[PDB]
RNA sequence: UGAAACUGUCCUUAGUGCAGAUCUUGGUGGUAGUAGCAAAUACUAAGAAGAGGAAAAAAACAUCUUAGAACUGAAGAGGAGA
């Protein structure tokens, strides 16, 4: 569960969800140890969904 | 180094000696990898093509298709003329 409320607390709105996109891809890195990340097209869309 | 013309003495002649003219023309520095590359709301994921996203996050990646999200808002960022 990625907590995205404290990543994005009080962050430039039209920069809001183009960063949840590279806070997820940070995440994956730190955690798999891969450098190559591939999101889900369902993971993008919910994302974007507000 | 350079590869085909040149020098010394005597007279003669002159477009004959440059550090300056905010001199003319041409070239080049320090400033300096500095000031900047900030109006027009905004981009994201998957795939294709390509030498052109690599990597101890080098956090950014131009074009095209699809999906999401958007703007001009119909006296328009539309369709047409002088």
């Known amino acids: 569960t990625i907590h995205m409320h404290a990543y ?3 962050e ?3 920069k809001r969800a183009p960063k949840a996109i ?3 891809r940070f995440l994956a890195i730190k955690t798999m140890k891969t450098h190559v990340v591939k999101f889900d097209m369902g993971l993008n ?3 974007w969904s507000q």
């Open 8 to 10: 994005l607390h009080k």
């Open 12 to 14: 430039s709105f039209k």
């Open 22 to 24: 590279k806070i997820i």
């Open 45 to 47: 869309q919910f994302i």
